[PDB]
Amino acid sequence: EVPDNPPNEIYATAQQKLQDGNWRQAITQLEALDNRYPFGPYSQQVQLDLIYAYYKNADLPLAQAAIDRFIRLNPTHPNIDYVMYMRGLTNMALDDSALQGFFGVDRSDRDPQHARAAFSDFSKLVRGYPNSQYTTDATKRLVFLKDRLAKYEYSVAEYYTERGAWVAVVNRVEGMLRDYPDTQATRDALPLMENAYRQMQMNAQAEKVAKIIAANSS
Amino acid sequence: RYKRQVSGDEAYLEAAPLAELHAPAGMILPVTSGDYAIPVTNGSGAVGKALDIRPPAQPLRTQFTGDTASLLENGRGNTLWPQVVSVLAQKNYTITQRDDAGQTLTTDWVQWNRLDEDEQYRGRYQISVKPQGYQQAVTVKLLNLEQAGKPVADAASMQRYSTEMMNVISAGLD
Amino acid sequence: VVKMSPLPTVENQFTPTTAWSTSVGSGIGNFYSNLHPALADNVVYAADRAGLVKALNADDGKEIWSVSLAEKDGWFSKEPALLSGGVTVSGGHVYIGSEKAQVYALNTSDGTVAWQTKVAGEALSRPVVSDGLVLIHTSNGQLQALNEADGAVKWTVNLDMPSLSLRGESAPTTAFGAAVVGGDNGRVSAVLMEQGQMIWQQRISQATGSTEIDRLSDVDTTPVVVNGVVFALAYNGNLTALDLRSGQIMWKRELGSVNDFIVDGNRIYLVDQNDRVMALTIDGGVTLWTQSDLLHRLLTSPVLYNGNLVVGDSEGYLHWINVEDGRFVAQQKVDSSGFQTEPVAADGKLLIQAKDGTVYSITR
Amino acid sequence: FVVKDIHFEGLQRVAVGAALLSMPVRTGDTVNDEDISNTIRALFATGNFEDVRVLRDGDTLLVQVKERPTIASITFSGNKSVKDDMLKQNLEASGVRVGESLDRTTIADIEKGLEDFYYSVGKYSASVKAVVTPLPRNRVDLKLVFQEGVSAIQQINIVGNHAFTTDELISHFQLRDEVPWWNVVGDRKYQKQKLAGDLETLRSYYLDRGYARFNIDSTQVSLTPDKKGIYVT
Amino acid sequence: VDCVAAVVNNGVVLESDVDGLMQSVKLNAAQARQQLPDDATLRHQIMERLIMDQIILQMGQKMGVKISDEQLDQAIANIAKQNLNYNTYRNQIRKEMIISEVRNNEVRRRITILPQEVESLAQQVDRAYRMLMNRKFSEEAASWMQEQRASAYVKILS
Structure with missing residues (x-):
């Protein structure tokens, strides 16, 4: 089901077909590659692609598990802003999307939980690294979440x-x-x-x- | 597009910006808890669909310091320049505009990386100089302006990918 | 399910036959105990689980008296009794024990009870009698002394229970004015019957494992004394001859691993749980020979008879082994019930009991 | 003696800077030629390494060191009384899970723990066996063999009591010695916690009927010398 | 050059240290007339001695046993009249004395004595009480060292 061959080609094919957008087949290849190459030269890039695939494939909880694995794996990485923003985005996406979105029903007076968690995550990000590339939209999200909680x-x-x-x-x-x-x-x-x-x-x-x-x- | 964008729930942009609550004389509002607090933060950042969501490329002493790719400890480091010539054209239809043999000093030509994602031809220029700081002959490639679809851009994400394509080529083949 | 059941082959030199079969019928059954009929003065005594005891005439099995032991003290007056104490007899009395912590002292030929006394803890030991007193070991760690006149519990000396353990608590052997018994933790303990005092004991069972849960490592077999020396076997091994003077060991042999052995007075024959019948010298401790054709086939205690050693089986087939290096002298298809008890051999008569076959005797 | 460049064979977890933080020898100037032993002791006491051999042939501390191999996956066979799932969470919770290192002390610990769990089930003919399979890139995979033959309960008695029959007590116990032919309501396995609950039920039965001066003097389990029959008193 | 021999529990064996102790003890054994066999049985005995004292070390460390520098000073003061580097000798003596102390602690924890066999041995021949104590200590130490020898988790790499 998978080719046990030297790693260069499997990485190359993995990035190529993620570049296509074949997530249903990319997630399996990436997870097998990671589990068989635990400490490759750039396994961090593997983990980030796994995050991307999981979010885009709408498997949010396993993505959350991968986030809290990566944060403890190396709490000091020069790209943790992306990981934190992806975590907050995962929370917010998990929170509010349903048939009400088609109906435009005001999702205010619903169960907050995830809203509060997303606000906390985004606030931690923005107060952590204001010089990053994910601050503006983050700040807008903070404003929106504050409004939502207040309305609730x-x-x-x-x-x-x-x-x-x-x-x-x-x-x-x-x-x-x-x-x-x-x-x-x-x-x-x-x-x-x-x-x-x-x-x-x-x-x-x-x-x-x-x-x-x-x-x-x- | 379903390719490089956040979910379509982007109506949160047009929310009412917050306004402060005046305190009249004779009484004071209770102290703010501060748990739900946002400080003033800069701008100049793409928002909505214009914002980019792609995993930043982790470079492969695998140097990763952004604009630099100074990897390093081989006694035959000077022999890497003819290897770079073999990479150019011969291996990948590339060419160095002005590359001396012994000096290992080269200037990259405007390339065209059509690696899908609706990413058109990207012309990346660079200077190929091999230093020997803190080690033997090291590899270094200081990139320059990139074109891509637009006439010019200087977003650090696409710049990082542009330098990283050469970085991963060099790392993979040697 | 995992078990290997090798079949001893059909080798024959003699053709003996069963002497008779009184066929008590329901004997012990699927239960497990240490029962064995006791013979003396051409009269044998056997017992039943339900509470039936028979005194038969030996050499024919002719019934003399037979009484039930219905629990008239109980509310229904006929409740099950569950006798598990060994059949023993001495003086003018015959002694039995029950799983309900009750000992019966009858009066032999009369068939009635000489006296009934209560014992703290279930009677799961072979009763022994000497120096005008009877030793009873219970499944709680206590040994007790009784008077054959009427009861007279002298003491209830407890030793230990290490939670999980195994049955068949050892019957003490008495000599030189002292009675020594095994123990559920290896402390083979000697007692002076004058006051029931604890003199000397030492650990025998070796348990060099990670946890003691699987390491039962207890001794529940009767020892034997020769002259200032006794022999005992633990489940995990530790064959040893140890001094009567105090807790000292002349020599050790880590094979052991038997719950019931026998000594010829000169040599020792024992049956490992893997059915490995081993022959041993008292001093040198050399394995004289072996016969491991059977692989954990649940054998019984060995007894000497006509120079050959007698072995039963849960398959209920009589077997002999030769004193010469260990061989298959003969096999007898006595019955098909199954055998668990300890055979007895005296007065030129070999008796063994079965779960349903019950009283079986051999003829050459 | 004096050293200028230091290198190591560890890449999976040995970060050269972190490795240098692990050794306080400073990797330079004169040393006493024996405190290296104590420094190596400290390195190994970090618990993340398996073996080390310093080479002083030249002038670099290129120490050959090997760490704990990581487990490729978790594979096992033989068990049928318990579904394999609770076994895999039993392994996972104890500290060993796919992707992390290996610790043979935990191998012995988990071997004895699974034996103990089987004894709790009552399957005393059980022997968990571990098969180590080394794999390239310093990997390992562990296979488990479970040869559980057969378990036993065969006897219950309430010796000590005088006012109640045994059977009426047996009518209340969760654990049953045997059940008649015209019903399949109950099984016959032994669970220690079931015995504890049964003792609680017996105690409640005696206490709620007035017998305040009551306790449990002693309870004994017992095994026949075949590992095929267990009694309780 | 320097390698690792074996690892028991959390303890480790070093060829440097064992070779040092071998060259320290064999010179004395030359006049002690201890006929040491070749490095097969010699290896067996040295590795078993090493694993015993080091497993005592790790068991004590797990159980939390410590000795202060004052007791080390007492021991070295006694050894001054009783008979490398001085601090290293202090360290080795401290480890061996704490090993012996923990050995005594555990043996006393699992030893037994009854004042009911003393009269029999007194009438057979208070010094005999000391002989009883000596025999009990010897048997207890032997039993404990054999039972923890294999029960401890040991791996051999050389």
Whole structure:
């Protein structure tokens, strides 16, 4: 099923047919090559091609395993920015894509998990190596993920406002504004805080946060 | 294209840039946790489909210091220049514009690497000089401007690949 | 499944026959124990698992008395008894033991019980009697002394159980005013019957392995004393002659690997678990000869008879081996049940018992 | 003595700089001709090497060193009581997995551990055998042979008790000595944890009926001298 | 030149060190009249001695046994009146004394003694108690060294 022949030709064919885009046959060849040439002269390049193939072949979890193998294999490589960006991209791609994408359904009030993980990964990347080539789009992704998380928390606060549990709403929106003070979600969530204070018979604080609106009338 | 691009979920670009929340006099907003914080960061980077996603080529003392390919420790290092001449033309229809025999000083000609990926003819020039620093006669190839499909470009990714094609040729054959 | 079962070939010089077969019927069965009928003064005594004991007349097997041992003390009064103690007899009494930690002392010809006494721990040993006292070893590490008058437990001296172990706890041998027994960890221990004190013991079983779980390495065979010297065998080997004065060893032979041996008084014949019958001298420790035609065929203890050594099998076929270097003198197709017990040879009579064949005797 | 250039035969893990960090001899100037032995001891005590032979024929420390070969894959045959999967995670968790080094101490450890697991299963006619196959590029592959003949339970008794029959106790134990003809409900293998749970059930049965002054004085397993029959008391 | 002989557990054998100890001991054995055989049985005995003391070393290191420089000073002060480089001699003596100390520790951990056989040997002929102790120590040491000889994991490379 595989030719046990000198390595030069198998590497050459591997890069050539990955260059074609034959991932279904490239992943097997690359994994067999790596498992039979564990410490070749440039096995790092093999591992990076494995990352590329796994991501493009949509086998994200095994790609994640390869990422956390490579990071511990050599925590100091002159190309780790690419690996970190690929890890963050894997998280984000795993997070949100479904029939809602065709339907345009707002994926805000869904399970964050992967969103938080992706934000953490991208933030670690950008705060690590600002001189790299993967900072701009990374920063845009940070902004988008922050907006998504803020919208999720706003949605849950809105449901609690719909119910009438006028304490948990205060805690949730307080956490929002403590964590996410520079987003639209707090901007439309502040009136929920005002309503909760007014309904809670403790209006001594209510007008207080009302003054907040007085500073952002626009 | 399904070849060298991120997934098509690229609508995240047109999101609202964040704006700060004013604190009125008489009260103070609570201290920011800072766990979800982004600092100011530079630009000048391709985004969306223009951004490149390809594995950077790891060079094969296998030198990898970007613009340089100074590998090295052979007593017959001077004999590598006629080997380079054999590589040129004879082995791969290549030619050095001005290559002395003893001096091992050559200037590369504008080549054409059509290695798929819709990568048109890429004209890479370089200077082939063999140093002997910290070892015997070393191999070195300082590349120059590349053409590819565009008239000119200086992205470090395509530049790295352009130098690495010669690097991998030299490493594989010797 | 893995096992090699070589067939001893058909070599014949003599043509003996079975003397008779009282055919008790249900004997021990698939169970395992150390039972063997005890003969004395032309009268043999045999026992059954369910609780039936028979006193037969020897040389014919004629039944004299036979009593059941239904557990009248139990709620149902007829519960299974599970006798596993060896058949022994002395004085005017006959002693048996049960797997339910109960010892019976009967009164021979009468057939009733002289006395019933309870023992702490299951009776899985051959009972021995001397100096007006009886030694009982249980499957918990205790040896106990009883009085043939009525019970009178003298002591319950425990030694050890190393978790996993193997059955057939050794029956102590007594001489020179001391009784020595084996042990489930190799501490062959001697006791003065005056006060049941622990004098001297030493490790015999060699276990030079990584873990002791598979290394059972215990001695559960009766020793034998000649003159200031005794002999014992462990499962892993360690044949040795060791002094009665204290815990000293004259010599060692790492073959061993037997759970029941016999001594001629001059030479020693033993049967390894690989059926390798070995002959040995007391002093030089030289392997006189061997006959390993059988490969772990689950043989029995050897007994001398007419100059040849007698061997049974789970195939239930009688076998002789020649004293001359080890040969196949004759084979007898006595039955097809299977044999596990220890044969007995006395008064020109050889008796052996089978799972279903039960009382079998030989005739030349 | 004095050395200027240092080289090594290790490439799979020996990084020359890291190798130099491994030896504090400084690779230069005068040395006492014996502290090299202690330095070599330190190198090997890093545990990543197998053998070393220093050559001082010339003036370079081109030390011939061999590390632990890596395992090509994990292959095995013979076992049927347990599906091979739990065996491969048993190997993987212990520290040995495809792609990493080899450690023969772990070979002995895992050999004895699998024997212990088989004893827990009750298959005492078991002998795991390791077959080492060297391969070029300093590789190794390990084959496992499992000759498990047959296991045994053949006897249970509750000696010591007086107020209850044995059988009614047997009616509650998870582990059964034997089951009659007109049913196939239960098997006959021995599992030690099953015995422990059975003891827990017996203890609960006696305690919940009022017998507070109760314990378990002693429990003994026993093996017949054939490795084909196990009893419990 | 310098090679490696064998490796037991985590210990290693060096031809340099073993050759040094052989040339140290054979000169004394010349007048000691110890008829050493050829390097086959000589190799057997030297390798077995080496593996014993080094396995004692690794077992002690695993079990965490240490000796301070004060005890080394005591030992060397005693050896000054009892009878390379001085620090190397100190090191070798420290390792051998700690080996003996751990040997005594384990033997005492697995030794037995009963004050019930003492009267029989006293009436047969307190020094005999010391003879009993000596015999028990000898048998315990022999049993332990043989049982850990093969149970330990050893590979031979030369």
